């Protein structure tokens, strides 16, 4: 009876998990029955691991021992399975169940019913549950590879979430809508929407991260590389620490490409770190090729790992690479030199003639990646004599940004010191 004993221990753990679900419910009533805001996040933060521990027989007993007011809609869950917020929480749990069970028809129907319910009820403490429902409904449609009807659905829902001055639902809907645009490769509608929507200044860390990823990708494709790099780097700094391996991988990949485009060389600690090595190795080879300026090795790497690039989505940035590869050469040359002559850039940048040198270096300056002058009366490319930047307003400005930031955190921290009674 080893199987029976294992089932017994698992069901004791299941009683523990049911107690955890009851505690989450109780927190939700602390919020809504207490009517105080928030605390739905408190009851919700354990959603991922709880989804992990979900169990079919456990939910079979749950959908018969829960729902004190048995509105008879429980029979839309019971057959497939074999309050104003707790019902949404339970429904989200059930759609999670079908999700991990790979049952994406009743999953979509039950998600639709959940959406009808949340849309009908015009609550203000239910917006967070609505946000999570939006995300998982999108994921259902994603495993079902429509991604299209969800566009209009989520887009109207975003309209509602921004009419009601909501933050969490607004951010999550904006994020999922951007994901849909990017999955269909509509980097013009995506850009227009990002331009004419304002992200909640007070938004979850996990949503800031995703928004920053998508915005950085939009700008990267749009050829605004400096802000693209800033956005991706900030997204990474915003990202979770002990999780989201895939998200970190994708942000890192795009950041490597964007930096290489700006003309820099990434940091090697990335390719070092164990959670990424296997993911980013193709970019390891690509960075070697770009740093060397070896177009032959670059072509080899493209022909050898091109499929992964077309998979993650980089395959135009990695030709804009070629361009910024010659740019990277000129940036190194102008980083360690002060008066290099053109006939000497031709060679050390692998060019043909001083005329081509003139054109390429002039364009590099125009793009503002080398910051030098040029003189063809004698043919040299003198840089800018560095001025001692402490008798200048640059320290002023830098410390101004940093002091403003510190003051802002003091403000936000002294705020949010809520006292209960």
């Amino acid at each position: 009876t080893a199987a029976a004993a294992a089932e017994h221990s698992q069901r004791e753990l299941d009683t523990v998990t049911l107690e955890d679900i009851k505690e989450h419910v109780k927190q939700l009533e602390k919020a809504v029955s207490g009517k105080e805001p928030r605390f739905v996040l408190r009851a919700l933060r354990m959603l991922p691991s709880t989804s992990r521990r979900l169990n079919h027989y456990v939910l079979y007993k749950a959908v018969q021992g829960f729902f004190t007011s048995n509105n008879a809609t429980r029979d839309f869950l019971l057959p497939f399975l074999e309050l104003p917020e707790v019902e949404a929480y339970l429904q989200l749990l059930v759609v999670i169940f079908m999700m991990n069970s790979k049952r994406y028809k009743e999953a979509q129907k039950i998600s639709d019913d959940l959406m009808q319910k949340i849309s009908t009820q015009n609550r203000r403490a239910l917006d967070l549950v609505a946000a999570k429902c939006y995300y998982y409904h999108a994921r259902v449609y994603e495993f079902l590879d429509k991604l299209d009807v969800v566009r209009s659905f989520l887009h109207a829902r975003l309209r509602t979430a921004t009419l009601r001055h909501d933050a969490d639902g607004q951010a999550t809907l904006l994020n999922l809508l951007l994901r849909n645009y990017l999955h269909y490769s509509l980097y013009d509608q995506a850009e227009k929407l990002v331009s004419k929507s304002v992200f909640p200044e007070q938004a979850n860390n996990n949503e800031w991260a995703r928004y920053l990823y998508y915005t950085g990708r939009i700008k990267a494709i749009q050829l605004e590389y400096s802000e693209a790099r800033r956005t991706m780097t900030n997204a990474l700094r915003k990202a979770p620490q002990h999780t989201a391996v895939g998200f970190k991988q994708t942000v890192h990949k795009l950041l490597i490409v964007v930096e290489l485009l700006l003309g820099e060389i990434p940091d090697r600690l990335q390719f070092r770190q164990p959670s990424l090595k296997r993911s980013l190795m193709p970019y390891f080879l690509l960075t070697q090729a770009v740093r060397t300026g070896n177009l032959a090795k670059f072509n080899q790497v493209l022909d050898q790992f091109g499929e992964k690039f077309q998979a993650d989505g980089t395959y135009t940035l990695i030709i804009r690479l070629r361009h910024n590869v010659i740019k990277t050469g000129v940036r190194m040359i102008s980083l360690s030199y002060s008066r290099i002559s053109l006939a000497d850039i031709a060679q050390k940048l692998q060019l043909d003639s001083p005329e081509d040198a003139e054109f390429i270096v002039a364009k590099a300056i125009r793009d503002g990646v080398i910051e030098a002058s040029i003189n063809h009366e004698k043919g040299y490319v003198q840089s800018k004599e560095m001025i001692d930047i402490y008798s200048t307003r640059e320290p002023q400005l830098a410390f101004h940004q940093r002091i403003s930031f510190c003051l802002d955190i003091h403000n936000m921290s002294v705020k949010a010191m809520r006292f209960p009674p």
């Binding site: 959603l47 991922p48 996990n206 998200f247 991988q249 090697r268 060397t292």
Partner: protein, 36 residues
């Protein structure tokens, strides 16, 4: 908090220099002395 499920997933602090050179500083210096 939430694992972003929508996204599928030496001991030496190396810092580049893994280039391809005619040895690091032996044949280079030999040829240098030879041509000087």
């Amino acid at each position: 908090d939430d694992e972003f499920e929508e996204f599928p997933a030496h001991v030496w602090e190396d810092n580049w220099d893994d280039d391809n050179v005619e040895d690091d500083f032996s044949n280079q210096l030999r040829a240098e002395l030879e041509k000087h």
